[PDB]
Amino acid sequence: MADTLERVTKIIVDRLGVDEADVKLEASFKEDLGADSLDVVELVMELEDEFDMEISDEDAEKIATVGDAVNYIQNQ
Amino acid sequence: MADTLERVTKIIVDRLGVDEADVKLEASFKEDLGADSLDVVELVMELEDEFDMEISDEDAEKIATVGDAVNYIQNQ
Ligand SMILES: [Pt+2]
Ligand SMILES: [Pt+2]
Ligand SMILES: [Pt+2]
Ligand SMILES: [Pt+2]
Q1: What PROSITE patterns is this protein classified in (chains A, B)?
Q2: How far apart are CA A5 and CA A41, in angstroms?
Q3: Inter-axis angle of helices A37-50 and A66-74, to 10 degrees?
Q4: A62 CA: distance to closest CA in chain B (Å)
Q5: 3-class DSSP state for residue B28?
Q6: SS3 label, residue B65
Q7: Do residues A53 and A17 make contact, with C-beta atoms less than 8 angstroms apart?
Q8: What fold does the segment set A1-76 form as a domain?
Q9: CA-based Rg of chain B, rounded to a whole angstrom?
């Protein structure tokens, strides 16, 4: 769904201050979008709450890229 | 962008007759969405035209999944 990706993208733009055009699926939060580790924890917390789901420690660590985040949401 | 994924998803639904809920990024056209090889060529042709872009033989062959298709679009 497009609504899911709009919601994910809105949050990344809110937190990381990047252009929407830079929020591609392959973009990694740290290497491409300027997030550091505190930011990334914060993003995941925020995504969890937006989609009313709990992500485990083990699964959250696999989330390097925008696409990784959407994949997890889409599998719940 | 959400508009890009809405456009990709509309086409897959049109051609393959699957529910929107089944059009996840990790879903492969052949193994998950019931497309055969003729369908896949047809999808790519259709996506090319929707986004006014030409995909090479070499790149189109790497497109197994919905996410693979969106990635290519997003990199052009
Ligand atoms: Pt969805
Ligand atoms: Pt991906
Ligand atoms: Pt886009
Ligand atoms: Pt992917």
Answers
A1: CARRIER, PHOSPHOPANTETHEINE
A2: 19
A3: 30
A4: 15
A5: strand
A6: strand
A7: no
A8: 1.10.1200
A9: 11
